[PDB]
DNA sequence: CATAATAACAATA
DNA sequence: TGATATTGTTATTATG
DNA sequence: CATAATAACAATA
DNA sequence: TGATATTGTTATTATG
């Protein structure tokens, strides 16, 4: 295995922002930087262990989810500089108890959500707002529209989605689409990495495709295309967040605030309610239209968030 | 820790059937027996390791689920003879890869089931058959009736269930019941071990309770009460299996054969379809009425088996 | 100070 | 079954 | 042999 | 997140 190397992406990130008008110092990226530097020319595992221990010591006090995320960042640095075969990857990681506790916390929140679905009283309005967004001249708007109407993740809509007409018999589907470019997935059997699959849309397919072409040809859109998640996050996140909040403030269910993933959750719910064939289950349907891996029905549990007020009505019929 | 001991239950099982009219030899129980015997006076971990290795060697060729089950039997023997603190418990177990593969196989079967629910065309007939069973003079029949009408496991209905009237406001519920005595659960936070909880019934509560008292007072019922799972299995399983098969042969969906747990699966489905409030999810509802642990929504995935032909109809409306 | 930028901080899938 | 990649919120910073 | 008992064998939750 | 407890099927055995 190699003893020298460099996590380019980190250094570059740090070199940009050498000249910065404002903003906080890249302290963490700096720590990562010096860590990877200190690793240059280390052959002894106790040495590596000591280094990492110092890093973990610094992290203490920070939140558990924060630590798990930071550990990912270090591990990805190590991988970039030194490769997959480097003994530091066996050393630089979270305690197993930490990850286990994350799992418990998350399961508990989900179990809690499933026992108290949120009735999305005004979802019809929300969906129309999205539809109209599809016709806006502001590419951010169109993108929001498409998150709502196709359920693709922001990073997907804005950065990497390919949308196609889906053939329905010997014609073209008006309520589904072809989609390619799933995020959060690496190459693999039963994985939608690089797979084009059919997904339902909550308005006419002609409309969605056309709005997408408008998206793909705009000024902002050519810049967005092929961005890394850090680039995209930096450039849009807070603006997207503010726009979504403003656009939906008055209609969004009282129990929570309007956030962009809200649109994806609602999309699953509505798509199921309108399109699910009878031999498939809700967990299955979601996992299918959300692009989850083969045999994964557990991610689908995260998305069961609201109850459409129609279901709430007719369940209250009994 | 102790170096001597005896797994009483195994030896007794072997002493019964010293005198047996027929049936195959208790070879496996014998192997377990001699294993625990050989462990008497072992202090060296390499010795223990060798012994166990010989056992595993014998098991080879047998199925994976078989091996996992057998390993449970040995581990339970060790525990009974020598206690929880014995170093053999760190040694006598399956390879982690084996358990992992079990998990994968099972997830794959479930994901498969969720994508092809079985339409239970005649469930109404099945349920009435159960109802009528509730009035039979044959305690086996009544028990079947109650599996169908309360969804409790066979071992629960026959051996250990306590059923009570459930108070509805200042009166008594006609479509729910109190139930106590959950199987497959050890003491714990967020566990129904020793907990009485309300469950829905698929016919009038008066009827279910009365049929249960008839069950609890019959000849066979006093014998059944408090049996161990081995006793119960030995005494009833094959008769229950044959009766359920005969009773339901002509009406049970074409894709599968009538087995007793079929009744519990259908019960969940029907109970949900008739009783689930709107703010709870199907996974949640099941987990609640099946007595699953707190924050466990994953067991519920096993039970999503059929589609009621009404749902199949009205989904095909779209 | 008064904000807009930025990256830390943090949570979710 | 090892230990990520995305989406979401706020402290801290430079400069008007 | 012809079955009924039994426990091994096996799968599911 | 370690490594079970229940439900389900069949080979093998003693004896009519
Ligand atoms: C909770 C959770 C963990 N992970 C973890 C599991 C492994 O640590 C890693 C998979 O690569 O990411 C997910 O990918 N998704 C999730 O929802
Ligand atoms: C697949 C599965 C495993 N187990 C295992 C997990 C542990 O090995 C053990 C729990 O005690 O049993 C269940 O209890 N239920 C299941 O459905």
XYZ file of C-alpha atoms (C1' of nucleotides) and ligand atoms in Angstrom:
728
model
C 0.000 0.000 0.000
C 1.120 3.648 -0.500
C 2.551 5.885 2.252
C 2.293 9.216 0.428
C -0.634 11.047 -1.151
C -2.999 14.004 -1.119
C -6.776 14.544 -0.869
C -6.906 17.011 -3.738
C -10.593 17.984 -3.326
C -9.959 19.128 0.254
C -6.855 21.161 -0.547
C -8.589 22.828 -3.525
C -11.625 23.615 -1.365
C -9.167 25.267 1.037
C -7.363 27.173 -1.726
C -10.607 28.543 -2.968
C -11.667 30.625 0.038
C -8.070 31.649 0.597
C -9.684 34.747 -0.856
C -13.138 35.017 0.700
C -15.241 38.169 1.192
C -16.678 36.699 4.401
C -17.750 33.519 6.155
C -16.329 31.314 8.883
C -12.866 29.727 8.655
C -12.617 26.201 7.151
C -11.323 24.896 10.463
C -12.552 21.297 10.012
C -11.295 21.016 6.426
C -7.999 22.368 7.808
C -7.879 19.649 10.474
C -8.549 17.019 7.831
C -5.818 18.608 5.715
C -3.168 18.456 8.439
C -4.287 14.952 9.370
C -3.714 13.622 5.852
C -0.426 15.539 5.833
C 0.763 13.913 9.077
C -0.098 10.529 7.611
C 2.509 11.130 4.910
C 5.262 8.668 5.702
C 3.522 6.685 8.474
C 4.232 2.949 8.592
C 3.333 2.101 12.195
C -0.207 1.316 13.230
C 0.212 2.687 16.757
C 1.266 5.999 15.251
C -1.859 6.083 13.025
C -3.951 5.104 16.065
C -2.544 8.036 18.063
C -3.173 10.559 15.285
C -6.810 9.444 14.847
C -7.299 9.450 18.584
C -6.266 13.106 18.663
C -8.822 13.883 15.937
C -11.649 12.085 17.777
C -10.614 13.972 20.897
C -11.152 17.231 19.043
C -14.596 16.138 17.798
C -15.904 15.497 21.309
C -18.734 17.744 22.422
C -20.020 17.906 18.860
C -23.286 16.001 18.148
C -23.378 12.237 17.356
C -24.772 12.686 13.857
C -22.138 15.375 13.401
C -19.345 12.997 14.443
C -20.607 10.247 12.144
C -20.689 12.728 9.231
C -17.203 14.110 10.031
C -15.794 10.562 10.271
C -17.192 10.019 6.764
C -15.332 13.088 5.624
C -12.000 11.913 7.049
C -12.504 8.394 5.701
C -13.249 9.787 2.233
C -10.078 11.956 2.449
C -7.921 8.956 3.424
C -9.444 7.044 0.527
C -8.775 9.855 -1.935
C -5.145 10.408 -0.915
C -4.029 6.870 -0.200
C -6.540 4.460 -1.751
C -8.829 1.660 -0.593
C -6.092 -0.657 0.674
C -4.678 1.625 3.360
C -4.479 0.357 6.995
C -5.737 3.742 8.281
C -9.218 2.771 7.026
C -9.291 -0.013 9.642
C -8.453 2.509 12.350
C -10.242 5.733 11.480
C -13.824 4.946 12.321
C -16.654 5.336 14.809
C -17.159 3.040 17.774
C -19.699 0.383 16.873
C -21.835 1.479 19.811
C -22.131 4.946 18.252
C -23.509 3.658 14.952
C -25.811 1.241 16.824
C -27.211 4.117 18.838
C -27.784 6.143 15.660
C -29.802 3.206 14.350
C -31.878 3.047 17.498
C -32.585 6.775 17.540
C -33.686 6.769 13.931
C -35.911 3.675 14.319
C -37.547 5.364 17.268
C -38.284 8.553 15.352
C -39.745 6.513 12.441
C -41.935 4.291 14.675
C -43.109 7.546 16.208
C -43.965 9.024 12.785
C -45.929 5.932 11.693
C -48.139 6.199 14.761
C -48.944 9.850 14.095
C -49.176 10.569 10.396
C -49.695 14.256 9.561
C -52.889 15.047 7.679
C -51.853 16.999 4.633
C -55.076 19.031 4.454
C -54.106 21.273 1.567
C -52.025 18.959 -0.581
C -54.077 19.830 -3.667
C -52.989 23.445 -3.442
C -49.351 22.378 -2.943
C -49.433 20.242 -6.010
C -50.994 23.031 -8.140
C -48.336 25.455 -6.942
C -45.762 22.979 -8.189
C -47.549 22.653 -11.465
C -47.566 26.409 -11.992
C -43.920 26.484 -10.960
C -43.268 24.316 -13.974
C -44.175 27.301 -16.184
C -42.030 29.897 -14.381
C -39.127 31.606 -16.197
C -36.960 31.263 -13.083
C -35.083 27.918 -13.263
C -35.113 27.567 -9.470
C -38.907 27.710 -9.666
C -39.129 25.115 -12.408
C -36.849 22.848 -10.392
C -39.092 23.104 -7.344
C -42.012 22.357 -9.618
C -40.290 19.213 -10.847
C -39.352 18.037 -7.347
C -43.046 18.179 -6.579
C -44.202 16.660 -9.828
C -41.632 13.890 -10.268
C -40.459 13.326 -6.685
C -36.826 13.291 -7.682
C -34.345 14.626 -5.118
C -33.191 18.276 -5.501
C -29.688 17.172 -6.384
C -31.203 14.952 -9.047
C -33.614 17.518 -10.580
C -31.058 20.284 -10.661
C -27.787 18.441 -11.364
C -28.105 15.129 -13.180
C -31.619 13.852 -14.050
C -32.363 12.550 -17.535
C -36.050 12.525 -18.375
C -37.578 10.697 -21.340
C -41.033 9.878 -22.688
C -42.209 6.472 -21.511
C -43.841 4.271 -24.183
C -47.353 3.122 -23.257
C -48.237 0.287 -25.577
C -47.707 1.729 -29.053
C -47.991 5.354 -27.919
C -46.629 7.580 -25.150
C -47.636 7.577 -21.453
C -49.320 10.679 -20.173
C -48.798 9.959 -16.474
C -45.332 8.383 -16.393
C -41.812 9.172 -17.564
C -38.399 7.570 -17.996
C -35.817 8.681 -15.393
C -32.066 8.067 -15.223
C -29.381 9.324 -12.840
C -30.353 8.153 -9.324
C -28.271 9.726 -6.496
C -27.087 7.898 -3.334
C -26.196 4.628 -5.022
C -23.014 2.912 -6.181
C -22.665 0.372 -8.970
C -24.370 -2.911 -8.086
C -26.780 -5.775 -8.686
C -30.322 -4.665 -7.920
C -29.362 -1.009 -7.830
C -30.623 1.848 -9.996
C -27.149 3.294 -10.454
C -27.086 4.097 -14.172
C -30.504 2.563 -14.689
C -33.348 4.257 -16.479
C -36.662 3.361 -14.923
C -40.229 4.445 -15.348
C -41.719 6.713 -12.694
C -45.195 8.242 -12.212
C -45.690 11.986 -12.614
C -48.373 14.074 -10.920
C -49.207 16.083 -14.064
C -49.109 15.459 -17.797
C -45.818 14.003 -19.055
C -45.609 16.493 -21.992
C -45.663 19.309 -19.500
C -42.981 17.804 -17.218
C -40.612 16.977 -20.068
C -40.993 20.438 -21.658
C -40.391 22.212 -18.349
C -37.306 20.025 -17.920
C -35.902 21.022 -21.307
C -36.449 24.632 -20.330
C -34.538 23.822 -17.152
C -31.690 22.119 -19.031
C -31.237 25.034 -21.448
C -31.359 28.026 -19.056
C -28.327 29.926 -17.842
C -28.410 28.537 -14.307
C -29.127 25.085 -15.621
C -25.991 24.742 -17.693
C -24.017 25.741 -14.600
C -25.917 23.236 -12.420
C -25.379 20.334 -14.797
C -22.900 17.789 -13.443
C -22.116 19.676 -10.221
C -20.725 17.821 -7.227
C -22.932 17.689 -4.166
C -20.720 20.253 -2.403
C -20.840 22.684 -5.318
C -24.638 22.374 -5.607
C -25.138 22.642 -1.845
C -23.002 25.783 -1.667
C -24.577 27.462 -4.601
C -28.286 26.713 -4.015
C -29.233 25.122 -0.753
C -30.151 28.224 1.258
C -31.910 29.920 -1.627
C -33.902 26.767 -2.367
C -34.724 26.478 1.310
C -35.936 30.079 1.520
C -37.955 29.911 -1.695
C -39.651 26.658 -0.671
C -40.427 28.109 2.722
C -41.963 31.278 1.298
C -43.861 29.558 -1.500
C -45.597 27.130 0.867
C -45.787 28.857 4.222
C -49.546 29.363 4.392
C -50.739 25.988 3.170
C -48.217 23.461 4.554
C -49.569 21.276 7.386
C -49.393 23.013 10.784
C -47.259 20.306 12.403
C -44.142 21.025 10.320
C -42.404 23.637 8.148
C -42.135 23.451 4.328
C -38.823 21.912 3.329
C -37.947 20.693 -0.174
C -37.870 16.899 0.684
C -41.417 17.464 1.890
C -42.275 17.485 -1.781
C -40.727 13.994 -2.317
C -42.565 12.507 0.677
C -45.915 13.953 -0.478
C -45.155 12.781 -4.013
C -44.769 9.208 -2.884
C -47.981 9.376 -0.913
C -49.996 10.926 -3.724
C -48.526 8.703 -6.409
C -49.394 5.637 -4.392
C -52.917 6.887 -3.676
C -53.444 7.509 -7.449
C -51.433 4.832 -9.258
C -50.550 1.763 -7.190
C -51.753 -1.507 -8.765
C -53.420 -3.898 -6.301
C -50.879 -6.746 -6.140
C -48.088 -4.479 -4.869
C -47.723 -3.152 -1.303
C -47.218 0.441 -0.235
C -43.633 -0.328 0.967
C -43.000 -2.006 -2.310
C -44.599 0.782 -4.380
C -42.566 3.496 -2.727
C -39.354 1.501 -2.960
C -40.052 1.037 -6.657
C -40.840 4.675 -7.573
C -38.204 6.150 -5.251
C -35.454 4.093 -6.895
C -34.512 2.120 -3.764
C -32.324 -0.983 -4.055
C -33.576 -4.446 -4.784
C -35.035 -6.123 -1.733
C -34.899 -2.866 0.229
C -38.310 -2.219 1.756
C -36.931 -0.536 4.848
C -35.934 2.839 3.349
C -39.558 3.158 2.241
C -40.538 3.421 5.942
C -38.909 6.879 6.143
C -41.345 8.311 3.626
C -44.581 7.397 5.251
C -45.157 10.863 6.626
C -48.675 12.208 5.945
C -52.274 11.110 5.499
C -54.243 12.619 2.598
C -57.413 14.159 4.054
C -59.527 11.888 1.851
C -58.137 8.778 3.551
C -58.549 10.520 6.863
C -62.170 11.184 5.993
C -63.150 7.717 4.818
C -61.252 5.935 7.619
C -63.272 8.096 9.963
C -66.308 6.680 8.136
C -65.785 3.518 10.177
C -17.936 -20.154 36.021
C -19.039 -23.806 36.527
C -17.388 -26.831 34.869
C -20.080 -29.408 35.646
C -23.794 -29.541 34.868
C -26.649 -31.163 32.984
C -29.295 -30.061 30.454
C -32.152 -31.764 32.263
C -34.827 -31.111 29.593
C -32.755 -32.947 26.974
C -31.998 -35.967 29.145
C -35.665 -36.253 30.206
C -36.776 -35.980 26.574
C -34.386 -38.871 25.893
C -35.625 -40.921 28.857
C -39.156 -40.560 27.695
C -38.977 -42.416 24.375
C -36.642 -44.956 25.921
C -39.934 -46.800 25.634
C -41.467 -45.795 22.307
C -43.955 -47.774 20.187
C -42.387 -46.337 17.024
C -40.705 -43.313 15.487
C -37.169 -42.376 14.518
C -34.272 -42.415 17.002
C -33.486 -39.153 18.874
C -30.074 -39.051 17.232
C -29.632 -35.251 17.404
C -30.795 -34.994 21.023
C -28.315 -37.823 21.691
C -25.478 -35.860 20.074
C -26.379 -32.829 22.160
C -26.467 -35.093 25.213
C -22.980 -36.510 24.667
C -21.682 -33.052 23.801
C -22.817 -31.578 27.118
C -21.420 -34.693 28.800
C -17.982 -34.250 27.198
C -17.987 -30.645 28.357
C -18.085 -31.888 31.949
C -14.687 -30.998 33.339
C -13.366 -28.908 30.418
C -11.210 -25.905 31.318
C -9.309 -25.313 28.071
C -10.759 -23.252 25.265
C -8.962 -25.190 22.524
C -10.565 -28.361 23.835
C -14.048 -26.755 23.716
C -13.237 -25.449 20.222
C -12.350 -28.967 19.037
C -15.515 -30.520 20.469
C -17.766 -27.900 18.818
C -15.874 -28.265 15.578
C -16.696 -31.975 15.574
C -20.388 -31.154 16.083
C -20.439 -28.620 13.222
C -18.688 -31.220 11.091
C -21.557 -33.608 11.736
C -24.167 -30.967 10.832
C -22.688 -30.370 7.382
C -24.910 -31.325 4.475
C -27.975 -30.375 6.494
C -29.799 -27.169 5.400
C -28.717 -23.658 6.542
C -31.941 -22.926 8.403
C -31.579 -26.381 9.922
C -28.041 -25.622 11.127
C -29.088 -22.281 12.607
C -31.943 -24.011 14.477
C -29.694 -26.860 15.713
C -27.071 -24.342 16.903
C -29.877 -22.724 18.918
C -30.611 -26.082 20.459
C -26.995 -26.682 21.498
C -26.630 -23.128 22.796
C -29.800 -23.520 24.876
C -28.450 -26.845 26.264
C -25.117 -25.249 27.238
C -27.056 -22.452 28.907
C -29.275 -24.866 30.818
C -26.441 -27.073 32.092
C -23.739 -24.510 32.732
C -25.333 -21.050 32.826
C -24.995 -17.752 30.975
C -21.387 -17.057 31.960
C -19.807 -20.105 30.337
C -16.962 -19.615 27.782
C -18.502 -22.284 25.503
C -21.197 -19.735 24.567
C -18.492 -17.623 22.885
C -17.393 -20.641 20.863
C -20.509 -22.610 19.993
C -22.102 -20.501 17.315
C -22.708 -20.012 13.609
C -20.299 -18.203 11.318
C -21.420 -14.610 10.921
C -21.590 -15.116 7.165
C -24.208 -17.838 7.689
C -26.556 -15.597 9.667
C -25.966 -12.743 7.188
C -26.951 -15.009 4.327
C -30.103 -16.082 6.183
C -30.993 -12.402 6.461
C -30.458 -11.849 2.766
C -32.513 -14.871 1.744
C -35.409 -13.843 3.935
C -35.360 -10.192 2.775
C -35.438 -11.443 -0.782
C -38.449 -13.674 -0.197
C -40.300 -10.788 1.539
C -39.501 -8.210 -1.189
C -40.782 -10.837 -3.593
C -44.036 -11.264 -1.629
C -44.694 -7.502 -1.467
C -44.480 -7.259 -5.243
C -46.991 -10.062 -5.754
C -49.660 -10.039 -3.085
C -52.093 -12.972 -3.298
C -55.722 -12.018 -3.837
C -57.671 -13.737 -1.115
C -60.838 -14.135 -3.204
C -62.862 -16.108 -0.690
C -61.736 -14.613 2.595
C -65.341 -14.039 3.674
C -66.020 -17.758 3.594
C -62.795 -18.445 5.530
C -63.761 -16.042 8.225
C -67.287 -17.530 8.550
C -65.810 -21.012 8.820
C -63.742 -19.722 11.714
C -66.767 -18.166 13.283
C -68.705 -21.421 13.115
C -65.647 -23.211 14.463
C -66.070 -21.102 17.558
C -69.283 -23.032 18.306
C -67.868 -26.540 17.766
C -67.713 -29.030 20.668
C -64.238 -30.129 19.556
C -61.636 -27.929 21.325
C -59.246 -28.182 18.370
C -62.000 -26.651 16.242
C -62.670 -23.828 18.668
C -58.949 -23.095 18.782
C -58.765 -22.825 15.002
C -61.781 -20.560 15.171
C -59.995 -18.313 17.643
C -56.768 -18.201 15.621
C -58.879 -16.859 12.794
C -60.948 -14.516 14.898
C -58.276 -13.086 17.198
C -55.103 -13.634 15.158
C -53.216 -15.010 18.114
C -50.577 -17.654 17.367
C -51.589 -21.340 17.801
C -49.263 -21.726 20.752
C -50.925 -18.694 22.288
C -54.576 -19.710 21.669
C -54.077 -23.257 22.835
C -51.484 -22.913 25.618
C -51.361 -19.551 27.366
C -53.716 -16.774 26.153
C -55.739 -14.765 28.655
C -58.731 -13.032 27.126
C -60.750 -10.297 28.831
C -63.547 -7.879 27.961
C -62.182 -4.522 26.850
C -63.937 -1.455 28.321
C -65.277 0.934 25.673
C -66.042 4.190 27.407
C -68.372 3.209 30.245
C -69.445 -0.069 28.629
C -67.826 -3.057 26.918
C -66.306 -3.185 23.403
C -68.018 -5.419 20.918
C -65.151 -5.566 18.421
C -62.074 -5.662 20.663
C -60.720 -7.698 23.564
C -57.973 -7.671 26.182
C -55.147 -10.164 25.498
C -52.235 -11.253 27.692
C -49.532 -13.888 27.221
C -47.595 -12.963 24.048
C -45.172 -15.689 22.818
C -41.699 -15.051 21.309
C -40.696 -12.265 23.669
C -38.491 -11.926 26.741
C -38.825 -9.390 29.534
C -38.047 -5.871 28.321
C -38.811 -2.195 27.796
C -41.235 -1.779 24.912
C -42.100 -5.460 24.856
C -45.472 -7.132 25.377
C -44.008 -9.841 27.588
C -46.525 -10.016 30.435
C -48.494 -7.105 29.040
C -52.218 -7.120 28.499
C -53.156 -5.136 25.434
C -56.296 -4.506 23.479
C -56.701 -6.290 20.153
C -59.429 -6.233 17.469
C -61.611 -9.292 16.921
C -63.319 -10.257 13.669
C -66.621 -11.209 15.345
C -68.511 -10.128 18.442
C -66.402 -10.051 21.617
C -69.079 -11.911 23.677
C -68.840 -14.774 21.252
C -65.013 -14.933 21.279
C -64.748 -14.780 25.065
C -67.439 -17.455 25.564
C -65.820 -19.797 23.043
C -62.532 -19.239 24.875
C -64.024 -20.213 28.231
C -65.363 -23.342 26.585
C -61.825 -23.925 25.341
C -60.280 -23.344 28.779
C -62.664 -25.766 30.510
C -62.606 -28.742 28.096
C -60.640 -31.920 28.656
C -57.994 -31.186 26.030
C -57.782 -27.605 27.165
C -56.740 -28.330 30.720
C -53.986 -30.537 29.304
C -52.902 -27.825 26.835
C -52.707 -25.110 29.472
C -49.125 -24.114 30.269
C -47.484 -26.621 27.907
C -43.959 -26.023 26.658
C -43.577 -25.425 22.949
C -42.126 -28.925 22.486
C -44.987 -30.594 24.343
C -47.605 -28.644 22.356
C -45.818 -29.240 19.050
C -45.610 -32.980 19.703
C -49.148 -33.353 20.824
C -50.995 -31.183 18.266
C -49.012 -29.857 15.371
C -49.769 -32.531 12.766
C -53.409 -32.846 13.735
C -53.848 -29.072 13.612
C -52.092 -29.022 10.267
C -54.335 -31.739 8.831
C -57.549 -30.233 10.189
C -56.694 -26.765 8.866
C -55.822 -28.240 5.507
C -59.073 -30.186 5.232
C -61.291 -27.414 6.569
C -60.017 -24.868 4.039
C -58.887 -26.835 1.017
C -61.556 -25.698 -1.434
C -61.645 -21.995 -0.667
C -58.024 -21.039 0.129
C -56.316 -18.944 -2.576
C -54.918 -21.084 -5.416
C -51.343 -19.836 -5.008
C -50.777 -21.497 -1.618
C -52.012 -24.237 0.732
C -54.025 -23.605 3.932
C -51.712 -23.505 6.928
C -52.681 -22.261 10.398
C -50.490 -19.048 10.345
C -52.421 -18.212 7.195
C -55.199 -17.303 9.576
C -52.969 -14.779 11.452
C -51.795 -13.121 8.223
C -55.378 -12.795 6.917
C -56.465 -11.539 10.336
C -53.997 -8.696 10.220
C -55.075 -7.768 6.727
C -58.783 -7.855 7.507
C -58.431 -6.097 10.838
C -56.502 -3.303 9.198
C -59.004 -3.012 6.344
C -61.876 -2.765 8.910
C -60.440 -0.969 11.943
C -57.292 1.069 11.305
C -57.643 4.736 12.329
C -56.280 7.205 9.757
C -53.237 8.626 11.578
C -51.558 5.215 11.893
C -49.755 3.335 9.096
C -50.319 -0.244 8.007
C -46.838 -1.281 9.312
C -47.641 0.441 12.529
C -51.156 -1.040 12.784
C -49.956 -4.581 12.279
C -47.059 -4.148 14.681
C -49.536 -2.872 17.250
C -52.178 -5.633 16.949
C -49.638 -8.432 16.463
C -47.867 -7.530 19.712
C -44.516 -6.655 18.105
C -41.872 -4.788 20.110
C -41.670 -1.055 20.467
C -40.123 0.598 17.447
C -40.260 -2.658 15.485
C -41.943 -2.002 12.150
C -39.887 -4.564 10.276
C -41.552 -7.767 11.539
C -44.809 -6.328 10.204
C -43.383 -6.705 6.663
C -43.641 -10.513 6.947
C -47.409 -10.359 7.263
C -48.245 -8.404 4.194
C -49.305 -11.451 2.238
C -52.675 -11.035 0.474
C -54.914 -8.445 -1.151
C -58.626 -8.502 -0.266
C -60.571 -8.734 -3.539
C -62.344 -5.469 -2.714
C -59.054 -3.556 -2.753
C -58.107 -5.434 -5.876
C -61.369 -4.339 -7.448
C -61.246 -0.653 -6.577
C -57.524 -0.308 -7.384
C -58.426 -1.722 -10.766
C -60.967 1.120 -10.917
C -58.039 3.400 -11.734
C -22.687 47.036 14.678
C -26.180 44.790 10.206
C -26.229 41.822 7.108
C -24.579 38.323 3.270
C -21.219 34.661 2.734
C -19.270 30.619 4.214
C -18.405 26.561 6.303
C -19.225 24.435 10.532
C -22.795 21.981 12.670
C -26.492 18.874 12.383
C -30.153 15.512 10.683
C -32.183 12.414 7.423
C -32.466 8.318 3.894
C -23.635 -6.386 9.445
C -19.944 -1.803 7.542
C -19.707 2.538 8.636
C -22.206 6.797 3.105
C -24.470 10.593 0.488
C -27.591 13.442 0.478
C -30.813 17.421 2.741
C -31.279 20.852 6.562
C -29.812 24.917 10.380
C -26.787 28.243 12.506
C -22.374 30.196 14.419
C -18.785 33.057 12.866
C -16.576 35.857 9.779
C -15.335 40.189 6.656
C -16.875 44.119 5.118
C -20.909 47.978 4.015
C -44.780 -54.527 3.766
C -48.852 -50.347 5.553
C -49.457 -47.211 8.418
C -49.122 -44.220 12.961
C -45.588 -42.320 15.943
C -41.649 -39.784 16.554
C -38.075 -36.860 16.040
C -35.199 -35.260 12.540
C -35.296 -31.869 9.101
C -36.643 -27.472 7.597
C -38.698 -22.648 7.270
C -40.688 -18.522 9.102
C -41.226 -14.217 12.341
C -25.611 -5.763 15.464
C -26.207 -11.137 18.466
C -27.258 -15.270 17.083
C -34.078 -17.147 19.307
C -38.803 -19.155 19.444
C -42.150 -20.351 17.158
C -44.697 -22.856 12.848
C -44.209 -26.292 9.035
C -42.683 -31.122 6.279
C -40.792 -35.705 5.898
C -37.494 -39.629 6.721
C -37.211 -43.480 9.648
C -38.752 -46.450 12.972
C -41.631 -50.364 15.515
C -45.278 -52.968 15.211
C -50.331 -54.504 13.089
C -29.129 4.531 8.433
C -28.433 4.400 7.117
C -27.151 4.034 7.049
N -26.441 3.904 5.872
C -25.001 3.467 6.008
C -24.859 1.949 6.106
C -23.359 1.861 5.896
O -22.685 2.427 7.002
C -23.212 2.767 4.685
C -23.529 2.085 3.366
O -22.555 2.412 2.380
O -24.164 3.844 4.925
C -27.047 4.140 4.642
O -26.495 4.040 3.556
N -28.368 4.514 4.728
C -29.126 4.665 5.880
O -30.307 5.002 5.848
C -34.630 -12.969 11.326
C -34.885 -12.951 12.799
C -33.899 -13.165 13.671
N -34.062 -13.175 15.043
C -32.815 -13.425 15.860
C -32.009 -12.149 16.098
C -31.078 -12.683 17.171
O -30.205 -13.644 16.615
C -32.089 -13.368 18.075
C -32.797 -12.423 19.031
O -32.864 -12.982 20.339
O -33.055 -13.954 17.155
C -35.308 -12.937 15.616
O -35.537 -12.920 16.816
N -36.314 -12.716 14.703
C -36.206 -12.701 13.321
O -37.171 -12.489 12.591
